[PDB]
Design an enzyme around this catalytic site. Structure first.
Site, PDB file in Angstrom:
ATOM      1  N   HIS B  41     -25.266 -25.979  82.134  1.00  0.00           N
ATOM      2  CA  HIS B  41     -26.221 -26.729  81.331  1.00  0.00           C
ATOM      3  C   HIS B  41     -25.637 -28.040  80.762  1.00  0.00           C
ATOM      4  O   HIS B  41     -26.372 -28.788  80.133  1.00  0.00           O
ATOM      5  CB  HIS B  41     -26.904 -25.879  80.250  1.00  0.00           C
ATOM      6  CG  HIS B  41     -26.019 -25.453  79.126  1.00  0.00           C
ATOM      7  ND1 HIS B  41     -25.396 -24.226  79.136  1.00  0.00           N
ATOM      8  CD2 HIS B  41     -25.740 -26.080  77.954  1.00  0.00           C
ATOM      9  CE1 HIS B  41     -24.727 -24.152  77.994  1.00  0.00           C
ATOM     10  NE2 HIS B  41     -24.900 -25.242  77.251  1.00  0.00           N
ATOM     11  N   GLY B 143     -21.390 -26.961  70.055  1.00  0.00           N
ATOM     12  CA  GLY B 143     -20.255 -27.519  70.775  1.00  0.00           C
ATOM     13  C   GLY B 143     -19.219 -26.489  71.197  1.00  0.00           C
ATOM     14  O   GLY B 143     -18.203 -26.851  71.800  1.00  0.00           O
ATOM     15  N   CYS B 145     -19.803 -23.997  73.363  1.00  0.00           N
ATOM     16  CA  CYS B 145     -20.044 -23.566  74.748  1.00  0.00           C
ATOM     17  C   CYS B 145     -18.917 -23.990  75.661  1.00  0.00           C
ATOM     18  O   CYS B 145     -18.305 -25.045  75.442  1.00  0.00           O
ATOM     19  CB  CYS B 145     -21.414 -23.989  75.283  1.00  0.00           C
ATOM     20  SG  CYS B 145     -21.928 -25.672  74.830  1.00  0.00           S
TER      21      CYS B 145
HETATM   22  C1  LIG Z   1     -23.530 -25.659  73.965  1.00  0.00           C
HETATM   23  O1  LIG Z   1     -24.306 -25.120  74.999  1.00  0.00           O
HETATM   24  C2  LIG Z   1     -23.211 -24.579  72.933  1.00  0.00           C
HETATM   25  O2  LIG Z   1     -22.470 -24.818  72.051  1.00  0.00           O
HETATM   26  N1  LIG Z   1     -23.784 -23.251  73.061  1.00  0.00           N
HETATM   27  C3  LIG Z   1     -23.462 -22.095  72.239  1.00  0.00           C
HETATM   28  C4  LIG Z   1     -23.733 -22.069  70.740  1.00  0.00           C
HETATM   29  N2  LIG Z   1     -23.272 -21.071  69.884  1.00  0.00           N
HETATM   30  C5  LIG Z   1     -23.714 -21.315  68.503  1.00  0.00           C
HETATM   31  C6  LIG Z   1     -24.486 -22.507  68.446  1.00  0.00           C
HETATM   32  S1  LIG Z   1     -24.611 -23.144  69.919  1.00  0.00           S
HETATM   33  C7  LIG Z   1     -24.188 -26.920  73.385  1.00  0.00           C
HETATM   34  C8  LIG Z   1     -24.131 -28.006  74.463  1.00  0.00           C
HETATM   35  C9  LIG Z   1     -24.591 -29.374  73.972  1.00  0.00           C
HETATM   36  C10 LIG Z   1     -25.907 -29.770  74.156  1.00  0.00           C
HETATM   37  C11 LIG Z   1     -26.320 -31.019  73.723  1.00  0.00           C
HETATM   38  C12 LIG Z   1     -25.413 -31.864  73.101  1.00  0.00           C
HETATM   39  C13 LIG Z   1     -24.094 -31.470  72.922  1.00  0.00           C
HETATM   40  C14 LIG Z   1     -23.681 -30.221  73.359  1.00  0.00           C
HETATM   41  N3  LIG Z   1     -25.568 -26.595  73.066  1.00  0.00           N
HETATM   42  C15 LIG Z   1     -26.016 -26.498  71.693  1.00  0.00           C
HETATM   43  O3  LIG Z   1     -25.240 -26.730  70.827  1.00  0.00           O
HETATM   44  C16 LIG Z   1     -27.462 -26.098  71.366  1.00  0.00           C
HETATM   45  C17 LIG Z   1     -28.225 -27.177  70.587  1.00  0.00           C
HETATM   46  O4  LIG Z   1     -27.544 -28.401  70.635  1.00  0.00           O
HETATM   47  C18 LIG Z   1     -28.332 -29.465  71.089  1.00  0.00           C
HETATM   48  N4  LIG Z   1     -28.232 -25.697  72.543  1.00  0.00           N
HETATM   49  C19 LIG Z   1     -27.933 -24.482  73.298  1.00  0.00           C
HETATM   50  O5  LIG Z   1     -27.014 -23.795  72.977  1.00  0.00           O
HETATM   51  C20 LIG Z   1     -28.796 -24.103  74.514  1.00  0.00           C
HETATM   52  C21 LIG Z   1     -29.995 -23.291  74.006  1.00  0.00           C
HETATM   53  C22 LIG Z   1     -30.806 -22.613  75.121  1.00  0.00           C
HETATM   54  C23 LIG Z   1     -29.931 -21.731  76.014  1.00  0.00           C
HETATM   55  C24 LIG Z   1     -28.759 -22.527  76.599  1.00  0.00           C
HETATM   56  F1  LIG Z   1     -29.270 -23.338  77.564  1.00  0.00           F
HETATM   57  F2  LIG Z   1     -27.903 -21.663  77.221  1.00  0.00           F
HETATM   58  C25 LIG Z   1     -27.959 -23.362  75.570  1.00  0.00           C
END
Ligand SMILES: *[C@@](O)(C(=O)NCc1nccs1)[C@@H](Cc1ccccc1)NC(=O)[C@@H](COC)NC(=O)[C@@H]1CCCC(F)(F)C1
Ligand SMILES: *[C@@](O)(C(=O)NCc1nccs1)[C@@H](Cc1ccccc1)NC(=O)[C@@H](COC)NC(=O)[C@@H]1CCCC(F)(F)C1
Lengths: 303, 303
Positions: B41, B143, B145
């Site tokens: 993603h 952040g 992930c």
């Molecule tokens: C990244 O995917 C992440 O940190 N995921 C795990 C988390 N655990 C606690 C909070 S989040 C991160 C990637 C990213 C997106 C955009 C800009 C910078 C980094 N994603 C997120 O932090 C989060 C919202 O931030 C915009 N979004 C998600 O985690 C998605 C939600 C739907 C399911 C998914 F696609 F798997 C990830």
């Protein structure tokens, strides 16, 4: 989200661990630049532990009495001296993995990470807190002496603890990296025991703030108490007195949650008086006192 | 003595973490040999998360769309491909700090260490267990992930988990290192939620053995039950059924303590029926299910 006992990444410290042998005694050492630090009782024998004179024991030793092993490479000892309860072994090679470091002494209530080691090899890492009676509740077995405790701040390792021994209750005692014991303990065989302990109040309130940040709110109430009326009840439950300085340290957590420090004190006052009624806070059924206000801010979201 | 949640030393894994950016999305990657692994993603945008076609999104990308940073040195991307929910970015340089490793998939009830990272930099290490509903109770912020979970056995890093997202209850979901999710979760925006969870019975008995090894014995009794009569009561308290294989795994702990597995089951049966009466076991007021029989043997004395 989530809230856990989180240790610092131990990488920087793992590259410093060595095995120090003197006779039949083997324990761990910390190699920084060209000096290896280890507990001085590595020069002692089972007979020499009633009331040893370490100055007498050290003078009857020579550089070739100390075998130093850094993984596989043997380190040649070119000097030796004692600094309080710690031995300083000058070696021929400067540790190429030496990080930026400080030797700092911590206070009761502060936390640090521990890299438990056996024979110069790290086995695990965990978080610890220095109690009011200067003991720690660690996890150590025979051969763990020389294991160090530390904190990390922008790649700088602040070493604060070296493990020396276990007390009869199963708690642990050690020194700072200058060889000075934490607490009234000695490195000789005595019937020494840990003194009375109190609960770290500022840490319990910080952990209640982590719970509010993480969605636990059942313990909140509309009430508020004075600092003095809170301290009267804290005294009865063997809790450390809360000071105005502690209220100022809790400020950022209070601002993030919109719950005043004295408001949070009224909830803690009720939790001490009535208990939890079978409910839990952050997966725990007791009040946790091993997270500082810093640890909570470091782990919790700023939102 | 002592018994704590102990993570593996994270050194070997810290040298593998990198920062992967694609557009405005920044997350963590794992650099082994000349391949960087990260959640797929990273190629998505906030608009592309309703029902993305990752094959369509990946084909509209080129090698220059991926910025890879290993500390300070920039890594040049010379290839890209998708493997299930994970991206594989071929880079020009083989990681000189690559340890001996395996990609293994773990089962519910097994534990592993987690190196939480932000922007390619490790912030902390802690221990986790895979639950029966394939979620973990970690500590992760935006952040995080790309953070990985692992076990170490004689300097071999067995990577078992990569963090992808947080579920509405605050629990965490991720994949193995081949890109296959643990559980019925997807990397798109849905109202997905964790299924029902059970307590890991073999882990609670292993932790009761650690307590006996560490001096906690108040919960013991003279009674003994059958495996079938124990499972009838376990079912009522939402505990996983105990099998003869679990009894054989608990064997070494039973031999060290002189307490039979079915004897220990009679104590657990009473703890579930009556509670603890305000007493504690290893500093906890609840029954702990996140220590496996291996974790107990690894930490406890063999005597
Ligand atoms: C990244 O995917 C992440 O940190 N995921 C795990 C988390 N655990 C606690 C909070 S989040 C991160 C990637 C990213 C997106 C955009 C800009 C910078 C980094 N994603 C997120 O932090 C989060 C919202 O931030 C915009 N979004 C998600 O985690 C998605 C939600 C739907 C399911 C998914 F696609 F798997 C990830
Ligand atoms: C070493 O000092 C050690 O591991 N200490 C801390 C412990 N934590 C839990 C159990 S021990 C180790 C050094 C050693 C001595 C002889 C042979 C090999 C290694 N000491 C011990 O393991 C232990 C008994 O082993 C023989 N003795 C002590 O820990 C001393 C007891 C009196 C106070 C002391 F001098 F500080 C240490």
């Amino acid at each position: 989200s989530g809230f856990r006992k989180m240790a610092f990444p131990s990488g920087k410290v793992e590259g410093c661990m060595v095995q120090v042998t003197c006779g039949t005694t083997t324990l761990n050492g910390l190699w920084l630049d060209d000096v290896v630090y280890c507990p001085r009782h590595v020069i002692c024998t089972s007979e020499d532990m009633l009331n040893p004179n370490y100055e007498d024991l050290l003078i009857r030793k020579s550089n070739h009495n100390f075998l130093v092993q850094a993984g596989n490479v043997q380190l040649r000892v070119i000097g030796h001296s004692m600094q309080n309860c710690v031995l300083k072994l000058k070696v021929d090679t400067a540790n190429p993995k030496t990080p930026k470091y400080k030797f700092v002494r911590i206070q009761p209530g502060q936390t640090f990470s521990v890299l438990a080691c056996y024979n110069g090899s790290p086995s695990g890492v965990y978080q610890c807190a220095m109690r009011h009676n200067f003991t720690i509740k660690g996890s150590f077995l025979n051969g763990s002496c020389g294991s160090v405790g530390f904190n990390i701040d922008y790649d700088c390792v602040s070493f604060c603890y070296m493990h020396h021994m276990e007390l009869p209750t199963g708690v642990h005692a050690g020194t700072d990296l200058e060889g000075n014991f934490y607490g009234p303990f000695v490195d000789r065989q005595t019937a020494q025991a840990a003194g009375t302990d109190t609960t770290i109040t500022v840490n319990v309130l910080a952990w209640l703030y982590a719970a509010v940040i993480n969605g636990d709110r059942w313990f909140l109430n509309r009430f508020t108490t004075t600092l003095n009326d809170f301290n009267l009840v804290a005294m009865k439950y063997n809790y450390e007195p809360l000071t105005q300085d502690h209220v100022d340290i809790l400020g950022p957590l209070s601002a993030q949650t919109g719950i005043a420090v004295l408001d949070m004190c009224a909830s803690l006052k009720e939790l001490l008086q009535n208990g939890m009624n079978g409910r839990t806070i952050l997966g725990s059924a007791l009040l946790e006192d091993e997270f500082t206000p810093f640890d909570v801010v470091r782990q919790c979201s700023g939102v």
